[PDB]
Amino acid sequence: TAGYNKFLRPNFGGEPVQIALTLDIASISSISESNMDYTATIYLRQRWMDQRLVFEGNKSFTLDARLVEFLWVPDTYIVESKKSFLHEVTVGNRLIRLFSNGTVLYALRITTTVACNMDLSKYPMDTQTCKLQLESWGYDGNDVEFTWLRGNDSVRGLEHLRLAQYTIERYFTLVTRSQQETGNYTRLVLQFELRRNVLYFILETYVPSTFLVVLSWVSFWISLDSVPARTCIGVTTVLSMTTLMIGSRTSLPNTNCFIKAIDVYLGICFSFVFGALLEYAVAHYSSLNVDHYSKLLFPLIFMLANVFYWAYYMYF
Amino acid sequence: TAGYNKFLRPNFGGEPVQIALTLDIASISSISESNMDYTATIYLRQRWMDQRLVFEGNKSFTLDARLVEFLWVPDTYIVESKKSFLHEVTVGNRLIRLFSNGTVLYALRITTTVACNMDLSKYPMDTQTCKLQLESWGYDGNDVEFTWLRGNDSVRGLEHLRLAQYTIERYFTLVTRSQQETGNYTRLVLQFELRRNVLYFILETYVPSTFLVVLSWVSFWISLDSVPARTCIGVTTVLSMTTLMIGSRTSLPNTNCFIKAIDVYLGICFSFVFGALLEYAVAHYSSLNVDHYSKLLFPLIFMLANVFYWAYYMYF
Amino acid sequence: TAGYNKFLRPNFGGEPVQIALTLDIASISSISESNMDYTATIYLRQRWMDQRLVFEGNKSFTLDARLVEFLWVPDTYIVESKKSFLHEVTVGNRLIRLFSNGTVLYALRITTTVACNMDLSKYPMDTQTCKLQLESWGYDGNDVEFTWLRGNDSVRGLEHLRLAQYTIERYFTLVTRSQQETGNYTRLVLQFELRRNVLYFILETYVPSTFLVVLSWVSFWISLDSVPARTCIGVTTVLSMTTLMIGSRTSLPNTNCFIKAIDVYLGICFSFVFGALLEYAVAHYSSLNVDHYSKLLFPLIFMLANVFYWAYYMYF
Amino acid sequence: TAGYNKFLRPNFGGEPVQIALTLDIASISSISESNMDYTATIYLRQRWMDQRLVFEGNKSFTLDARLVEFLWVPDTYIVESKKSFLHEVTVGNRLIRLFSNGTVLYALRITTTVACNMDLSKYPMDTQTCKLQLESWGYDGNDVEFTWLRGNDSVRGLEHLRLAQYTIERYFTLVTRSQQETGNYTRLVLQFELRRNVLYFILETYVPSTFLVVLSWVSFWISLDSVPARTCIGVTTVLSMTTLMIGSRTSLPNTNCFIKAIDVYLGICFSFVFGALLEYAVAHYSSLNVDHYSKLLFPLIFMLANVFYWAYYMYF
Amino acid sequence: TAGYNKFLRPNFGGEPVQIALTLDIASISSISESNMDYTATIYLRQRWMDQRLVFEGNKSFTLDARLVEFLWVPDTYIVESKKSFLHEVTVGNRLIRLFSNGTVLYALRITTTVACNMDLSKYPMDTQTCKLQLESWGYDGNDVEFTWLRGNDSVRGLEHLRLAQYTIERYFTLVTRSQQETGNYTRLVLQFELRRNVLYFILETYVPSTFLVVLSWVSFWISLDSVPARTCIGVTTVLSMTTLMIGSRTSLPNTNCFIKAIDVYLGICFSFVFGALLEYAVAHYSSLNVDHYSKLLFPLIFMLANVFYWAYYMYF
Numbered sequence A, B, C, D, E: 001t002a003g004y005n006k007f008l009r010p011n012f013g014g015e016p017v018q019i020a021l022t023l024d025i026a027s028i029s030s031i032s033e034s035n036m037d038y039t040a041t042i043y044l045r046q047r048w049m050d051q052r053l054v055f056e057g058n059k060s061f062t063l064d065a066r067l068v069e070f071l072w073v074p075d076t077y078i079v080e081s082k083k084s085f086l087h088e089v090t091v092g093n094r095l096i097r098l099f100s101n102g103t104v105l106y107a108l109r110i111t112t113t114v115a116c117n118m119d120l121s122k123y124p125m126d127t128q129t130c131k132l133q134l135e136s137w138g139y140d141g142n143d144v145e146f147t148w149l150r151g152n153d154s155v156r157g158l159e160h161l162r163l164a165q166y167t168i169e170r171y172f173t174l175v176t177r178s179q180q181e182t183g184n185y186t187r188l189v190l191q192f193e194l195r196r197n198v199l200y201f202i203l204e205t206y207v208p209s210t211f212l213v214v215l216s217w218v219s220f221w222i223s224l225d226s227v228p229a230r231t232c233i234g235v236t237t238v239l240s241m242t243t244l245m246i247g248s249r250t251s252l253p254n255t256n257c258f259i260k261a262i263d264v265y266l267g268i269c270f271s272f273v274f275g276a277l278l279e280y281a282v283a284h285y286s287s288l289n290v291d292h293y294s295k296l297l298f299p300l301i302f303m304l305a306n307v308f309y310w311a312y313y314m315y316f
Ligand SMILES: *[C@@H]1O[C@H](CO)[C@@H](O[C@@H]2O[C@H](CO)[C@@H](O[C@@H]3O[C@H](CO)[C@@H](O[C@H]4O[C@H](CO)[C@@H](O)[C@H](O)[C@@H]4O)[C@H](O)[C@@H]3O)[C@H](O)[C@H]2NC(C)=O)[C@H](O)[C@H]1NC(C)=O
Pocket: A180, A181, D060, D099, D100, D101, D102, D103, D153
């Protein structure tokens, strides 16, 4: 039998081993944009056929995890894993199940940290297509062929997963063929699109900015004769805009090097406030008309620009 | 005897193994709302019957932990564990106790990090029903049946536990039947309701906000003739409200994406201050009556709104 | 001999093993009030008698640490340890010493993190009685009896330890009997009282608050005729008190949920400043006497209140 | 055969083992300037010839990773590694491939943290030449000779790598000879120049500073007759410059002890603002001409100084 | 031969083993004053004579690291290590070299974290004499005698090490005799004096404070007639001094409980500014002479006090 053949894959020499995969994401622990990765716990299930491990019977038997050290198991590995570990809570979280016809069920609880590149250009409404790829580290396509057990039904838990900030709406599984120097491999890629919620940032960041712009508009009505009111409203507007900029800049650490969307909108609001103050100063200098015309020109142009920005960042 | 049968569960083929469970939470190390989990140390005790491990005698014997590697132990596992480890202080923290009739006592010190979903909508008075679920990773309900030794007496230490911010008032144990693709499992769920203290946030955050609103009310009495006093009181009110908002927003990191309760109350206070300032400005503009009427209208309506908010967030 | 009896404790069946303990705290690495624990390195020494490990001779012999895997060692464990590890610098930091009459010396370097509950009510002058408890995880009092080798002598290094913020003044060792569900255990508890230094917080936090209150007192002498000086002194007082409050609140993270002592004193100072400003405003309103009477009333009452607070928080 | 000769290197005594190396940087996880290191995942491939491991055949065979414990593998090590670990996702990420003529392919997934010294003098445009050096820890040049399989081809993935803040433009591999006390070693050094992006810091930090200097220039046009406008513009300029300095100083922790470039430019801008304010004060004192001459002198000299600084920090 | 004698030290019974030590600090990774320790990577080399490991020959042979598990190696350990680990990059970073006459070379790459007590009284110019002590954990002076191979030449890399903030100027090695309860041990202590750079803190913290004091001096020239200029200069001075105090207090976390030197100097500057403001207020009150006399008295006394402070904190 397979005494010292545990190093030899089933059908050592000839047809490769067809391993069917099943994934069950118990929970996506975190999604770090600063480190550009995601930590998630998965229930990796693999099913192959070992002709040397067959027996006479009708039913299957669940064996201890310590038997894994005596049998052959596929060298499955996450392609873009930075740090992963099999859970050892009480014993090794390994399920091994031997079947009559040779089927071997191998289940593991793996907490993995996969790095998916994130483009934060449309940061408030960005959709990140993050992938979890499983491949054989040592055995190429001529030795191990990885396959999905039930297509897109193989992966479970992603449909009902609701993260803190993101939400999976479209996930699917593919059987790609990776071409490396050592050889050709069959890679199983489960890719899912994480879309951040849109309402939170609007009601918590965009609404205060709109209120600041409204206060800047109101600042036009107050004239220079009432210097206390003008000074107070200007101080409040400037201080609130500075605090809003600070709060927006402190949400995400200085790690990204792209042009964001919330930053552009806040810069537009700050530029509008600065231009309003500069126009008030210029009107005062010229007087010692324009303000009345601005009181009607600013709302229409500002609303049109806001609609243009929204149409640009939602549709095209 | 069970020479190589340590991989075989007791009564391998036929009736399952009835394992009685006992829990003893020594300490809940932390409760992280940002990561939405809790780290706690538990004294997991399991009792089953091994017919192959029986002997002739009357008394029980405590064996070394290293004997665990030679016997069969259940593959108990925490369902929602992110990171757990058996303590190795001097030796492996394992108690194995063999009995005359076949009873096996298996005790472990496990520091586990279980993720329980937290809803922070009523954040100052939120009650989180966090669960600790134990299940067999490999053996289904037809092989291992998990049971509580003494019902709700089995779990000890939760009644006398007093955390820093929370307090357990109602905890109970259930025997649920989890239906997975591999098979049906008997899960033991100890769920406990953690209720945060109510007085600390009221006396440290709500009271300063009430004092700020009182100062805003007092600002009405001071007229425009004394510009220094009005300027000082307005500056103090605005600066204090901004600092209070900053302190409230820095307590919890930017991880939750829900509408909180302390945020709503602080926003109401900020809106009241802003409306008071705007009404003062409008009254000054109209004069160059309303303030006297407001001095009587504001207290009653404000108190009624506060009572309505309290009744909404305490009862229904 | 004890071929496979390494799993069997000495005198397996009958009188228990009397293990004498010796502790040597090399350094208390940290004392975290936010996590409510302390990390310290200890030189754990255990001495028992193994009748099966006796030989003919007169002298003792130091054996390699790898021999520990072949002998029986007590399952000593820290009762409230959150994370501990035996040091592996070059080899395993284990001293095993075999003696002629059967004495076995077992020394380990253990960096442990013990959680001791901290009451921060009198935070500037709090004394925390933190304990380090050693117990047998598996063997009860009928199998292993833990004893202190030399009573309060046994523990060394605590008398000469001077931490950054604390100072041990009274430490002692007790032999308690813990009653658990599994059985009764002999626990060795070394408890030490850590007292924080009193002068640092007085000279760095209380003195600036006293200077702020003195400046608030001086603010009474300046009249309303010199509006620049009054405005400057008021701005300086308010800004300094806000900065002092911020610095006091940022020293300890938002983890405790108790009423502190430094917070109470700073709140008293802030209330005094606010009351001084309010009284100045009320006197100005009434004039358009009281201030002169206050200039004499405030010092005596303030000093008496400070003495009462000091007597309350030092003696009773 | 090589029964106990796994401790003996191939050709034990005589000609050394020629090991050909291949590197494949899957991802550079992080580049920490505060800790002055970089964490990256590499696919280390080694090819040597074991005369004792030859067999009769024509094709190669991929063996299990557990066979590595039975064969001889080179003691390759990263020279400046602070913390590294071979990935264990499902099994040990080891590829072992035995060939007919004796070639042995050994592939490992290693996440390493190499410390490369960073000179942050020209911090916005600094180019760091960070190295990854592989050497034999035990076997000197007379026992193991490390060689690159394909010269600069050998390393793959660096050309297409685009980090968050840096960009590799020139990387190359060298075979150096390290002279140590124990012996002479053949070190394989892959050194790559990481150049930080230039546009982000200009458009996000330098542009606000330029706008602040422009506002300071505009402050000259406003005269002392309009004290509200002058006070507002001065307050805005000072507050904005302080906030910009704070934001620049909070980007990098207080770890470097060098004279940076962004700090010098921001200090120049702050000195310009302070000198403008001082000159305005001096002109007011002298009046109770210079400002008109300054309105023309400042732009030319400021632009020339900026061009000189740019030429200094880009070319020489 | 030494079949089971690997637990027995060479010359088991009689003369002790003379182990010659060699140190090579590859890099001091960090020096944490908050935790009062330093993390550094060392190349620990030990040379002893094993009479049972001799063979017939003329040359030495480098054996695999896995042979270490079969031989006897000294139980060297860092006396004040909080956390250390032998590097496992590809294999165990162990060099074992057997010689003809019995010499055994044992080299290890150890990243260690040694706690050296730090006195931050003269914090800007503090010199910390931090030690790295190596001792035998189990074998006393009658079993293992640790010796330096070449005295001060034994340690390499410290002379050319230039850290971020510190600089080693005087390091030396000593053979001390530690007296413990178990026995007397030969400890090898390499102690080095780390001196922080003096110019960085002067040009980045002391220079802004001096500029603030200069601005406070200039504030005397401006009279009360120009209230805008006086208000602006006072606001700038107070705000800049507060920001400088905040920046100085945020450099080091609230962990030390000593009287620093930079804190004393900044407090002196703050007291000077406060006294200048108080003297201006008192002069204004008395007028409604002193300022002219102060304009000459302040520079000389301030310079003399600064020189006295410098002489105190540099020489005696
Ligand atoms: C023992 O037998 C071995 C196999 O039976 C022999 O190894 C092979 O040796 C040949 C040549 O000696 C190698 O061919 C080269 O392989 C290179 C790497 O694949 C090729 O480079 C091309 O491909 C890589 C990968 O995509 C590109 O990155 C690169 O830019 C280029 O396009 C060469 O072009 C060439 O084909 C062959 O790869 C080796 N096989 C393996 C598995 O390494 C070995 O030489 C024999 N030894 C003796 C002494 O006879």
